């Protein structure tokens, strides 16, 4: 329902045609810092549970391979 | 146990060539369509 969704006053939007602009304007040289910024802002909340459960997995397999070992 | 193995890998090679031809075109079309939104600039002047 375009036309009766919201009420916005005094805003200006500028846009270009896709045929008068580049499809990949400075792709790598402006995309690598943003990807590194997002990774630095999110890896401290995503990664440490995965590191702890990798430690849990390795400890479990180490105990399973250490289960009997011809016990004296 | 797997008599289809050679023809399976032949269809896999066909798939890899098909997707290597297709997916750059679809990605370029998506970037071309979304380049209007990714170039949009917004201004707000209250009275």
């Amino acid at each position: 329902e375009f036309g009766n969704l919201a009420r916005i006053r005094h805003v200006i939007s500028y846009s270009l045609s896709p045929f008068e602009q580049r499809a990949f304007p400075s792709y790598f040289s402006k995309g690598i810092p943003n990807v590194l910024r997002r990774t630095r802002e999110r890896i401290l909340r995503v990664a440490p549970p995965f590191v702890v459960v990798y430690l849990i997995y390795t400890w479990g397999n180490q105990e399973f391979e250490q289960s009997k070992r011809k016990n004296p | 146990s797997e008599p289809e193995h050679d023809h399976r890998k032949r269809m896999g090679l066909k798939m890899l060539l098909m997707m290597g031809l297709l997916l750059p075109l679809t990605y370029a079309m998506k970037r071309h369509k979304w380049s209007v939104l990714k170039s949009r600039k917004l201004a707000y002047r209250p009275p």
Binding site: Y14, E20, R22 | -
Partner: peptide
């Protein structure tokens, strides 16, 4: 004033 506005420079995106 509507004459006070102008489009920004799109030089980093334009060909």
């Amino acid at each position: 004033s509507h004459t006070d506005v102008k489009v920004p420079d799109f030089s980093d995106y334009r060909r």
